[PDB]
Design an enzyme around this catalytic site. Structure first.
Site, PDB file in Angstrom:
ATOM      1  N   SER B  44      -4.908   3.362   4.432  1.00  0.00           N
ATOM      2  CA  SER B  44      -5.418   4.731   4.497  1.00  0.00           C
ATOM      3  C   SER B  44      -5.678   5.237   3.093  1.00  0.00           C
ATOM      4  O   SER B  44      -6.729   5.834   2.818  1.00  0.00           O
ATOM      5  CB  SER B  44      -4.393   5.643   5.150  1.00  0.00           C
ATOM      6  OG  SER B  44      -3.988   5.085   6.375  1.00  0.00           O
ATOM      7  N   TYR B 134       2.506  -1.200  11.082  1.00  0.00           N
ATOM      8  CA  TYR B 134       2.312   0.061  10.367  1.00  0.00           C
ATOM      9  C   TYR B 134       2.341   1.214  11.313  1.00  0.00           C
ATOM     10  O   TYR B 134       1.403   1.378  12.077  1.00  0.00           O
ATOM     11  CB  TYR B 134       0.954  -0.004   9.653  1.00  0.00           C
ATOM     12  CG  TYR B 134       0.530   1.181   8.819  1.00  0.00           C
ATOM     13  CD1 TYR B 134       1.395   2.252   8.562  1.00  0.00           C
ATOM     14  CD2 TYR B 134      -0.745   1.207   8.231  1.00  0.00           C
ATOM     15  CE1 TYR B 134       1.000   3.313   7.736  1.00  0.00           C
ATOM     16  CE2 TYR B 134      -1.159   2.266   7.406  1.00  0.00           C
ATOM     17  CZ  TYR B 134      -0.279   3.315   7.170  1.00  0.00           C
ATOM     18  OH  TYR B 134      -0.677   4.395   6.417  1.00  0.00           O
ATOM     19  N   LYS B 162       6.198  -0.862   8.356  1.00  0.00           N
ATOM     20  CA  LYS B 162       5.959   0.261   7.446  1.00  0.00           C
ATOM     21  C   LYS B 162       6.262   1.547   8.272  1.00  0.00           C
ATOM     22  O   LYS B 162       5.516   1.896   9.169  1.00  0.00           O
ATOM     23  CB  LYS B 162       4.512   0.250   6.957  1.00  0.00           C
ATOM     24  CG  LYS B 162       4.229   1.295   5.889  1.00  0.00           C
ATOM     25  CD  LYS B 162       2.723   1.360   5.526  1.00  0.00           C
ATOM     26  CE  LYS B 162       2.414   2.366   4.412  1.00  0.00           C
ATOM     27  NZ  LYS B 162       2.360   3.800   4.850  1.00  0.00           N
ATOM     28  N   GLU B 189       8.004  11.553  -0.346  1.00  0.00           N
ATOM     29  CA  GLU B 189       8.795  12.768  -0.474  1.00  0.00           C
ATOM     30  C   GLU B 189      10.230  12.611  -0.032  1.00  0.00           C
ATOM     31  O   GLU B 189      11.029  13.527  -0.251  1.00  0.00           O
ATOM     32  CB  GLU B 189       8.206  13.850   0.390  1.00  0.00           C
ATOM     33  CG  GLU B 189       6.748  13.894   0.320  1.00  0.00           C
ATOM     34  CD  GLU B 189       6.081  13.162   1.454  1.00  0.00           C
ATOM     35  OE1 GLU B 189       6.127  13.680   2.586  1.00  0.00           O
ATOM     36  OE2 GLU B 189       5.478  12.096   1.200  1.00  0.00           O
ATOM     37  N   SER B 205       1.657   5.917  -1.654  1.00  0.00           N
ATOM     38  CA  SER B 205       0.455   6.142  -2.480  1.00  0.00           C
ATOM     39  C   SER B 205       0.727   6.628  -3.880  1.00  0.00           C
ATOM     40  O   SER B 205       0.116   6.144  -4.823  1.00  0.00           O
ATOM     41  CB  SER B 205      -0.534   7.091  -1.799  1.00  0.00           C
ATOM     42  OG  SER B 205       0.053   8.364  -1.608  1.00  0.00           O
TER      43      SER B 205
END
Lengths: 291, 291, 291, 291
Positions: B44, B134, B162, B189, B205
């Site tokens: 993504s 995923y 994942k 986060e 990411s």
């Protein structure tokens, strides 16, 4: 200073669903002996939403008698109505609690504005006790933003926040924005991660039966003993799996019964009884918890 | 042996939004130099769903050329089509990636059987490479039960998962059932809380610009140094706070641009350009991250 | 025979937020005069969830005093507690209501069996009055499947279904399975479409101020004049558009205040009052409804 | 003048999962002969998201080739990419399509501004061809507000809206705001109610096997025969009930196979087969659809 590990008190009912007062006093004493920091009384776990305001005043008064200054007392004083919470907020002072709390009003769709005035009104009626803002989107259906949470948690009178959310990003953001706020972890299942993310302590229903485990997780983390923090969590989690299958409140009440604390493991209708298939597990766990 | 902190790779486009091969390579090497354990390519974050198969195979071939042997390489090979997914999976074998990976096909409401047969068909074409399941309900719209998750994680040929979910009760549940499972934390986060709950690594990411903080948390937890695992996670969240304002893919590309890695910080349309108002903030971030 | 265009009665309060008995009788009578088929009393619209049992019971008594034998009268007896619901169900019979109704219990997650038992328990207490199962997923949070609706509707005792849902496919499936079931449309904005889909009547809050228009929609369609049916439905939606901005209950209470039906247009806190900018629009609406 | 009852075309494949141009041609012809007002090609029903641009452009060609002039023609051209969409928009004009259409780009969260921009680019590339905004919250997960829809519906070049939502209050606020706008009802199950709320026709997938029933509903409401409008919709709804059991696209292609129109009734994988047990009924449906 009202930071810590606090049990969300169950409210024992008898065979005819009347409040069982002896088991309440008993559960309170049991909870004290176990070494819990305080008690959060009259919340979701205390089946408040299925009792009358006077039944709720009663329980408040009794746990106050029992609990004086042995432990920290917090009264969930919330209703959908502001006047009813204000009345309970008043009694809370009368009975000498150390704080008062309230879920964000549910069912009817209210504006954040109306939520803030609601908290303000209760805090006003609490005449001095600090407020503990109670967040729990799952049950209340009220979705609050971080901004709204900053606004609520800044009202004068507000001294703590009960985060009953699995969003640990929001957990760190709240701690980030409010370094000195007493932030309590609401989901027992993620206690260790909630604390690594910024919770000071926690308020939970499973604290009633193995409160020492959670007290254990804090010790391990303060000392950096992560593997034993992970051990206590997974052990707590194998119990939470079982409780979720049996229904948490009733299942908790059952274990407490096998521990000779609660005379009748009944929740009030519409809650149904625990399935007989689950007793073997529940007695085995009651036995084992006497570890 | 897929365990590690692996960066979810951005794909740089030129001014005419065509692939920019020079910056891809610059980006691979930047990561390699940052000491990231490996790269998850074509996901993504890679804007994979806005590229044609060929464009996707191309980046596969180019990063293999640049990475094969230096670090671990996982290939996101998933499309909504099984057939297309297979094509990319065969190419990943061909190019020499260490594992292959795929999102649960989205848009049409497929059945879980349909989903299982889908992973089976690709595993096959991967001719030997471990499959990385995923999970990302947020973007995909697929809410898998933990039971369903266990069936997939135990499907012959699957080697990892994942977990792009913030549900950390479910994190420890998966670890409990699958003690030898490679479990990657998917939400940056909460990385530290994810590891604590069970993840043994992560694919994220923001690793593209500060992979070292993430690797640092792994170190700090191993040590039993929670206070610094926390210091670091808040350093990462302050960044993420900003990136979400600006747009994560474009803001990462922008900070990397100011870092002299990526030429044009453009994402393909329909993504838009970074709001100029944030440019000075991102400019600053790039600068201080050269720490 | 409980088919019809029924108004969801508002419960008037005074300056002190106590029940305004006079305005209530005036409101009961306004509806009678406006030609409505019946009143659904003590529901959401009636702010039941923000009043006590005695208050709820008071309102039931008074409206039965005022409207007995003049119109159909359905009592919303529903509560979270089955026992509280049973209490009011017995009163409804005592005051002489025609049906008894209950929302699916909320806040706590109850199983579908627990829900059925709940209705059975209340139906038993109604000792003869039929039950109007009340489906309001948006407010209650209880997502019932069609099968579940088929089971609940086939319970002995149940005579009608209050579909407060916008899914008009499920409206015809219900009608298709249950040709004799009384099926009230719950969303006023889609009234005309709901009757076309299978609803045979409807219960609604806006019926309080312009009940004559929904009567017209029913007349139109029966007479095959979809031009007036649409004409009236858009006219109603124009007002609904307004009410949603002002807040529905308060907005309707203000309009009735200008129609001289209600003394004090207040709702119980937490609801705040109508914003001054809406006054001229409502004042003007109240004036033209005198059509 | 693109107001009508348009069939969302199915795209036939062979045993090998490639295009069965032979059957596509036959399908187009079958719908024409059926009496359909036009065809919508390359949308979700046309398995577009599991086709390549070239396959989609190829389907655009063969049907333009087969139906130009005979009926209205609307090419669904949406892709998550603005560029791939623009490429297909250009071909739609080239092959002589009457109008162009695009779903709100999905998967990655884009802003409304980004969506508006995307539409402008496509509108630009269709060089004169009017745009049909395609709103489908369920499959796309893009939630547009009434204000947003109003903005899209007024973008220059936009000729109609394909409302694929069962929210019939929104349908009428749209019709109210835009009386001249071509509004396509997107949910077949509520077609008759969709029209009574404001739509002027519909684009549906079940139209391929029973388009006449949908024309009949238009005729019925036109003449004010709501009774036969209702009879017809429940007939359509019983088919829809089954189709949702088998799987709609695979189920449509199967009844069409029994009708001689489609040779092999496969959908591309990830879709599996129609479970053997449904064959008898589907065969029976086709048997009775020769009405």
């Amino acid at each position: 200073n009202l930071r810590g590990v606090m049990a969300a008190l169950l409210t024992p009912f008898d065979q005819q669903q009347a409040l069982d007062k002896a088991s309440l006093r008993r559960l309170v004493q049991f909870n004290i002996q176990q070494g819990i920091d305080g008690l959060y009384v009259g919340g979701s776990t205390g089946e408040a939403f299925v009792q009358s305001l006077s039944e709720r005043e009663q329980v408040l008064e009794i746990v106050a008698e029992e609990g004086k200054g042995k432990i920290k007392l917090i009264a969930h004083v919330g209703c959908v109505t502001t006047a009813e919470s204000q009345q309970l907020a008043a009694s809370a002072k009368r009975y000498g609690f150390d704080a008062v709390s309230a879920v964000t009003p549910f069912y009817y769709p209210f504006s954040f504005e109306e939520h803030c005035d609601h908290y303000r009104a209760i805090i006003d009626s609490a005449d001095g006790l600090p407020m503990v803002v109670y967040n729990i989107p799952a049950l209340s259906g009220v979705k609050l933003t971080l901004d709204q949470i900053n606004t609520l948690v800044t009202l004068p009178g507000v001294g703590a926040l009960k985060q009953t959310s699995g969003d640990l990003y929001q957990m760190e953001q709240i701690r980030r924005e409010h370094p000195d706020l007493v932030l309590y972890n609401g989901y027992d299942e993620i206690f260790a991660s909630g604390l690594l993310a910024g919770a000071d302590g926690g308020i939970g229903s499973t604290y009633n039966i193995m409160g020492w485990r959670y007290q254990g997780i804090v010790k391990a983390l303060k000392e950096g003993d992560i593997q034993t923090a992970q051990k206590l969590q997974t052990e707590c989690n194998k119990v939470i799996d079982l409780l979720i299958k049996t229904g948490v409140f009733r299942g908790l009440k059952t274990v407490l019964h096998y521990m000779d604390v609660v005379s009748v493991p009944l929740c009030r209708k519409p809650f149904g009884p625990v399935d007989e298939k689950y007793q073997p597990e529940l007695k085995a766990l009651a036995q084992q918890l006497m570890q």
